[PDB]
Point group: C3
Chain length 337, copies 3
Amino acid sequence: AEIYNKNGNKLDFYGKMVGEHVWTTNGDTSSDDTTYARIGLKGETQINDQLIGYGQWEYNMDASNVEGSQTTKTRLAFAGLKAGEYGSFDYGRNYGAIYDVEAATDMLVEWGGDGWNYTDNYMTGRTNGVATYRNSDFFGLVDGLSFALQYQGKNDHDRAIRKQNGDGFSTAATYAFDNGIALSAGYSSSNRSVDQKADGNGDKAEAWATSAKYDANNIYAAVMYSQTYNMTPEEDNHFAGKTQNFEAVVQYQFDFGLRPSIGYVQTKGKDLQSRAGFSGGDADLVKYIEVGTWYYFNKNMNVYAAYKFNQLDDNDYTKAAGVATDDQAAVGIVYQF
Amino acid sequence: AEIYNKNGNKLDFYGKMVGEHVWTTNGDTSSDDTTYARIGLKGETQINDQLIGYGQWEYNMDASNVEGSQTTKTRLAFAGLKAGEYGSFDYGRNYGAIYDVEAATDMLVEWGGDGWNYTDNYMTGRTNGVATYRNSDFFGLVDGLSFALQYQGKNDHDRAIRKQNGDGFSTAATYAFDNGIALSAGYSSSNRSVDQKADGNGDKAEAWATSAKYDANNIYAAVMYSQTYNMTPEEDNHFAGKTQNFEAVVQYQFDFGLRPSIGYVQTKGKDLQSRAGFSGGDADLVKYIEVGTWYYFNKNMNVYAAYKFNQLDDNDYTKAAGVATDDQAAVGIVYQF
Amino acid sequence: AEIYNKNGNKLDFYGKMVGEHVWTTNGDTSSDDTTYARIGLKGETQINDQLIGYGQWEYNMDASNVEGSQTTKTRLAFAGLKAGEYGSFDYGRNYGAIYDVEAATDMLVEWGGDGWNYTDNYMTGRTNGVATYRNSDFFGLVDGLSFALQYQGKNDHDRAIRKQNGDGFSTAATYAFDNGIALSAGYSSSNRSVDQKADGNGDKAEAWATSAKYDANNIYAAVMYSQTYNMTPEEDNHFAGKTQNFEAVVQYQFDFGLRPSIGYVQTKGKDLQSRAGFSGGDADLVKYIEVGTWYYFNKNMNVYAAYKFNQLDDNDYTKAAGVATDDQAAVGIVYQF
């Protein structure tokens, strides 16, 4: 909500309170509260006729653990300049540029966006130390054609190997048409960290992705294909040498507020490393269908429910790596502002 | 303070900065800073003629420890719907319903509310994973008669035994009269967790409570009686098989802002378990008098002072369980908004 | 930004998002993201004709670490009363009074204020448990002459020895002239903690400081001299018996927004204790030049860059104590509100 707008400077203080509960089932049902709150700020200042300054901060607060044991997280923290057809530049903790391509299918009710995209994993999600140049309409020449060019410095110490990265870059472009179709494509290439390279599997972490979406006439549909190389962490902290990823989603928005959704997520690992209990070879890392619904009361209140049909089978890989194969269900109630 | 009210949606951003210091005395005086800040949000949205949506978040920040060692706590995080005479429903981190009955005597200057009520202890205080139905005037039929019905899921893993609970429910009713008298009563019954039941003391945690208050004509007076069963944690993490609890408070509000208070809190443990250094039997868990005062400058600023006459004597139980027997004193200065 | 001002009560919700990166160089260059966000509140209430109440809270959120590993810090949390010519009183977590004297030279781009001033170190910076009386114009008699008198309680347990203190006091005065010159002087004297006194080096921690500044006509210049005794922590947690400290800074503000700066910081330790690898004697603790610049777009947006010429040489002391001798560089982009 906009809580300040004076002298050319605006502040939007936004957030949500999410009451949520999640069940897991297959061999005995169990369930947990997963409630949280999130707050953030978007600031904007008019500097001159061609320049605007901006900042964003976003902060997660767990409320499912006891007081004294709840984690907090700064999800985003960046500042930038934007100059019309010249583009924009921002720096700090932000989304990776190749995540532009994942945004279309990362629209599920409870899950989604968890195949080849991870928090603090190169530029596949939110991440530290990214400098990002963007341009919204190709220098004023092509309405609806936008792109991003991003640099990330090494984050190679005082964090888990699974979350490390070396220096690298990512890029993405999106062409949005008036009829509601949008196409995206993007790329990521980085050096690995010294601690990662000691696994002997190579010196670079790389990825490419494509997506298509239709968003009009109360219908939403999207598909995404991607591949990653030495980038996607496994549950036992190995990196997959290669992945092949596909996602799809279809939703319909009724005028009275109901919004049903069916989504599909698959991440197939290729030639995964041998390890205790697993002789090596291909294995699925992530494979599920989500069926669910929202009911939107208004822009400030919603409820939702979802079920995950987990398509992974108990096998040598899932046992060795520690991958969950059980189905899940969730419900929630959200106030937002 | 209300910082947004537009298009049917309101936001109250509230909080306080509390400069506070606490002394302990009996065998040598010692003292500590106990300063903190607290912030929160209450949101409300008008959905249609009969439906309002709402959310609340509240967040504690210690400021008495050094930077880098200060704990933070999400005290409340929930969202809900309310529909006039049909009642309200909310879910998340919230107060237990039986705490309705404790609210009348939990009004002391510095202490209070710490006999049979604990944070993260079934539904005796703030707690995880509560679904709460409320109704304010008995379906429109009885002005001043309200009630609460609450369900809590199991919180049985990845937390201390003292803070665990199994699935259960609590309820409370309050009848508030025009003359300033209000009467409350309530109940709580839950399964214990598997880790708790291994103490051999039984499968259920239960409680009942009653209270009466007078709040008018510048006078405040209240009394509370309750009993709990396998619910109240001791200082060495045993659970009391049975407690008998009594609290009382009397205050007077002068027009110029002074508000003196005398309060009494007792929690008597019945047939407490034998353990190193303690042959078993009854013992007081909590027993003190608080004498203190506020001076309210206005609704945004106050100061206060209080003394705790700790009536516990050093005995086998207090030594064995680690219960403090010393007197205490406190002063504070509060800005609030 | 002022987000509430009604019924005599105001609230300023302020903060910044700081995208920042820091390099170190001498033997191989390395670099790290150092992004963070900061928020805070200043509250004020008009109580009567002669009394105002106030509160301040300020909160730091690291955004350079991964989610799940980012530290947060309550920098300030206090409440107070002010009564015109009678002065003001506040209590909580606040700046030490002798820091008044350091404020003039603690104006560098990236570094500064890190010679004899430390967070949680008696009253040399922000610290716990300070009661502070201030008066702004010597009881209405001398415009521009202000002073502070501060008491701090012992913080002697459950924290590192380096951050401990016993009971003590500090004071400062500032005489600000219409021509842009200001002179400050101040003093600090405290008992040490029991755990500190066991080092055998004495029972008191003491300091004195003086400063002068010129701030007018687009020019800023300042100098500071101070000495501390059993107060300044070394990098290996010894306390220096005596320090001799000098700082200087010169800046120029161009109308179009550029603000160059050159600053100097030195802290010389006298008769430092013998220890593994170091036979004892004098040594520099801190000695560097900073050259840098801001570009202020407006009051809501700036960028900056700085270089630290680290004048410390690798010797027995720097090796033994673990003191960094390498040069550093930084850049940043800030949105503020």
